[PDB]
Amino acid sequence: ATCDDGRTTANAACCILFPILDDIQENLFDGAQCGEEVHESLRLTFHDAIGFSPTLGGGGADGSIIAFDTIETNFPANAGIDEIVSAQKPFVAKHNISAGDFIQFAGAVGVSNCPGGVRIPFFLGRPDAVAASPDHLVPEPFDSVDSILARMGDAGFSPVEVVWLLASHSIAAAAKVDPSIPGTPFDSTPGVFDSQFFIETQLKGRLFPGTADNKGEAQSPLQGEIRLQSDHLLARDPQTACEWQSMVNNQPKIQNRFAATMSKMALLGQDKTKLIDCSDVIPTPPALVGAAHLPAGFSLSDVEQACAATPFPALTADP
């Protein structure tokens, strides 16, 4: 199918997305950059979608965090989310797609801006949200691995899938964990969808990059990087640590698993056969610049190995 400006897509219904794409690349993502708003928009897909529990309710990836922002953005686990929800609201008001559709679309478009990144499958047609998420559905960085895996499993995700999803922290910062240093990234290449995150979370902690007593925070190996206590445990806990380590310098696996599991999350509370596949509207991501490596001054003796069965992979380091 050919749309009114000459761009082509497999399903004609997908044509309405092209102007939205143009609008968000320029005005949400600063000219199709992999920056702050991509990071925030990706976080948003998860905070929207994970509001889904057979026992307590929530319609999953349904736009509820926008439609019902007054309730949802005041949940403690949604700290700092109101800023991206306010940025996105006017695009949803202006255009003719549902909030739920817009959140997943914006997420997928954003990630496609990041070198190393993937084109997350995208379906159009979600209806407007009909309920707010309950509170206590979003994992918090001071939660146990047991608690996190139980929460995620309740939403339909296995332990390994939680690891695959946390590839997102390769392009992510925190603002509210340590509010004296807002925007401090979880790995050293927040602009690059790579395995640096999995390497640096495995390094021995050295310092607190800001203040020293924040809930949900662990020592970082690097100034200007922040480590969540949750990432610290997941990297090291026997349930997840071998999966964790397997992502390292395994870019094809990161890409393949993140895209698959992101498509699964984006579809939570939704029916794929009721939606139209518009995946081909998402841009082609650039290729990885870099192989992932140890930061300068580090060696392999800096790695806390936690996988019993497999020795951490050899790695290059800067001089």
Ligand X SMILES: C[As](C)(=O)[O-]
Please state, in angstroms and rounded to a whole number, the distance separating the CA atoms of residues 115 and 268: 27
Binding mask 143-172 for Zn ion (x = CB under 5 A): x-x---------------------------
Residue 72 as a binder of ligand X (CB under 6 A): the answer is no
Nearer to Fe ion, 238 or 290 (CB): 290
Name the catalytic one among 47, 169, 232, 244.
47
Q: Which of these segments, 98-106, 124-132, 138-146, 178-186, binds ligand X (CB under 6 A)? A: 138-146
Q: Which of these segments, 91-99, 124-132, 173-181, 203-211, binds ligand HEM (CB under 6 A)? A: 173-181
Name the catalytic one among 164, 169, 232, 244.
164
CB under 8 A, 24+ apart: contacts of 75-83: 75/133, 75/135, 75/136, 75/138, 76/140, 77/47, 77/135, 77/136, 77/137, 77/138, 77/139, 77/140, 78/47, 78/138, 79/176, 80/175, 80/176, 81/40, 81/43, 81/44, 81/47, 83/40
- H/E stretch holding 124 reads strand 123-124
Place of tokens 């950059």: 33
Binding-site partner at residue 151 among ligand X, Ca ion, Zn ion, none, CB < 5 to 8 Å by type = ligand X
Contact pick of 13, 30, 181, 306 for Zn ion (by CB under 5 A) = 30
CB neighbours of 213 closer than 8 A, spacing ≥ 6?
none
Structure token pair of residue 121: 């499958």
Nearer to Zn ion, 237 or 302 (CB): 237
- Residues 49 to 68: which contact ligand HEM by CB under 6 A? none
Please state, in angstroms and rounded to a whole number, the distance separating the CA atoms of residues 121 and 244: 24
- Residues 8 to 47: which contact ligand HEM by CB under 6 A? 39-40, 42-43, 45-46
Binding mask 123-162 for Ca ion (x = CB under 5 A): ----------x-----------------------------
Say which DSSP state 82 is in: H
Please state, in angstroms and rounded to a whole number, the distance separating the CA atoms of residues 218 and 236: 13
CA dist 112 → 32, 47, 121, 174, 265 (Å): 9, 20, 11, 21, 17
Contact pick of 37, 69, 161, 243 for Fe ion (by CB under 5 A) = 69
Say which DSSP state 203 is in: B
Binding-site partner at residue 30 among Fe ion, Ca ion, Zn ion, none, CB < 5 to 8 Å by type = Zn ion
Q: Hey, how many other C-beta atoms are within 10 angstroms of the C-beta on 232?
A: 19
Contact positions toward ligand HEM, by CB under 6 A? Answer: 39-40, 42-43, 45-46, 80, 139-141, 143, 148, 162, 165-166, 168-169, 172-177, 216, 228, 230
Catalytic residues: 47, 164
Name the residues that contact ligand X, by CB under 6 A: 136-140, 143, 147, 151
